Ligand binder design. Structure first.
Ligand SMILES: Nc1ncnc2c1ncn2[C@@H]1O[C@H](COP(=O)(O)OP(=O)(O)OP(=O)(O)OP(=O)(O)OP(=O)(O)OC[C@H]2O[C@@H](n3cnc4c(N)ncnc43)[C@H](O)[C@@H]2O)[C@@H](O)[C@H]1O
Ligand SMILES: Nc1ncnc2c1ncn2[C@@H]1O[C@H](COP(=O)(O)OP(=O)(O)OP(=O)(O)OP(=O)(O)OP(=O)(O)OC[C@H]2O[C@@H](n3cnc4c(N)ncnc43)[C@H](O)[C@@H]2O)[C@@H](O)[C@H]1O
Ligand SMILES: [Mg+2]
Ligand SMILES: [Mg+2]
Ligand SMILES: [Zn+2]
Ligand SMILES: [Zn+2]
Lengths: 216, 216
């Protein structure tokens, strides 16, 4: 299954993607994750991406499309994949079409995780992420057993650099304007699937599984 | 962990820095210490810098940027570094941008230790420093157990020459006018973080340490 996860900042793409890959085995490919890994490793890509990411702006299309094209060519994508946070603009979506046509892996469906913008600031400010595995928690909505540490590996939890108030605000502004054009693009193709993400994590996933179970 | 510590004269950069270097082991790079070490060995850099430091004025940008660029290229900065007192002019900040881009070590955070200017004269005129290790004490706020000597190594404590009323006032003057442009510069970059430095030393450090999880 060839899938795309889309949604506004903090809608729950990572949270749902974690459950998806466990059950279906396709690689979870998050451009955000890839950019942060690059920044952590201090590579040229990371340095270029940093200036945009830190302010909450989108990283330019060319490099972003470029790292995705490279990543999707890996052997672990032979049986499917789960893109997360890409495409996030119409131009990226049209570029992906070409890339997938060449790799012979056209998209099956695009899952849009719908969540009221007015509730995203809270999901992000309350977010705590594992410094070891990258899994996310929320001080109120999905807290760890032991505060400050990951349930899975005992790793230290921290706050993402771009989860501060001003940056979160910018990320919402920037992505909201890219949102309807992208939904229209995939709606026109007919494979956009909207899922209400303002529910218990397990209920959101239950809907996702009802779709994915028909794609094996 | 690439960090910059900024704050008005006496706000507590050295104090917090010492804590950071112990918990994380990244080099503590203080331009003031560098210039004073030079003044002691009486190198030509030291003699040039002296005129400015004794008057409380800023050493010129060119020579200052030069010694920092060389310092940051050392092998001990491989895992990160703690800049202290640099940059302190927009020109220095822009130069640092280039230097770090060339070294591929971009700044993670610029930590501004905020302390009201009205209490700094007292912090500096009451400061006593160990002639052996350089750690600082305060006659009222953080006194040595035995007056005049360092708790750690027994070394004699002294009062830095520039911690006199006249020079302190000039230092506050000179640095206050450079402060807002620096804050704006880094607020623009997206990684400026303000910390209330008018609390007990460990309370201030707790907030600093909170920002440090998740940095490699
Ligand atoms: N294609 C692209 N083009 C250009 N630039 C790009 C790009 N892709 C990335 N970038 C760049 O990368 C940066 C950010 O990218 P990215 O990491 O992709 O940012 P994002 O889209 O804003 O998404 P988030 O990771 O912040 O959230 P998420 O939806 O995964 O939510 P999560 O599951 O963590 O959940 C959030 C919180 O909510 C909680 N939560 C999850 N589900 C629920 C639920 N059902 N109920 C209650 N709480 C929940 C979680 O525990 C957590 O604390 C930007 O600077 C940008 O420039
Ligand atoms: N980039 C650059 N460009 C051009 N010129 C440059 C330059 N960099 C340096 N220079 C030149 O060098 C000169 C000196 O530079 P520099 O040495 O960097 O001077 P500074 O910026 O004035 O800072 P200080 O060292 O005096 O104070 P601090 O913030 O470290 O405080 P500390 O922790 O000791 O604390 C102070 C006191 O407060 C006490 N204290 C600390 N924390 C607390 C607390 N939380 N509560 C109560 N007391 C506390 C301490 O015990 C202590 O006694 C400049 O004037 C300039 O001429
Ligand atoms: Mg995510
Ligand atoms: Mg100092
Ligand atoms: Zn973990
Ligand atoms: Zn000492």
């Amino acid at each position: 299954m060839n899938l795309v996860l889309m949604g506004l900042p903090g809608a729950g793409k990572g949270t749902q993607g974690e459950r998806i890959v466990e059950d279906y085995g396709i690689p979870h490919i998050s451009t955000g994750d890839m950019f942060r890994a690059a920044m952590k490793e201090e590579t040229p890509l990371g340095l270029e991406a940093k200036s945009y990411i830190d302010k909450g702006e989108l990283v330019p299309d060319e490099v972003t499309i470029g790292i995705v094209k490279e990543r999707l060519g890996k052997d672990d994508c032979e049986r499917g994949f789960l893109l997360d946070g890409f495409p996030r603009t119409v131009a990226q979506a049209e570029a992906l079409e070409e890339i997938l046509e060449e790799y012979g892996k056209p998209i099956d469906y695009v899952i849009n995780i719908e969540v009221d913008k007015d509730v995203l600031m809270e999901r992000l400010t309350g977010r705590r992420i594992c410094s070891v595995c990258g899994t996310t928690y929320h001080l109120v909505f999905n807290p760890p057993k032991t505060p400050g540490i990951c349930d899975k590996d005992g790793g230290e939890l921290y706050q993402r650099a771009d989860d501060n108030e001003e940056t979160v605000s910018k990320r919402l502004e920037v992505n909201m304007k890219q949102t309807q054009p992208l939904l229209d693009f995939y709606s026109e193709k007919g494979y956009l699937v909207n899922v209400n993400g303002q529910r218990d994590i397990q209920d959101v996933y239950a809907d996702v599984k009802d779709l994915l179970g028909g794609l094996k």
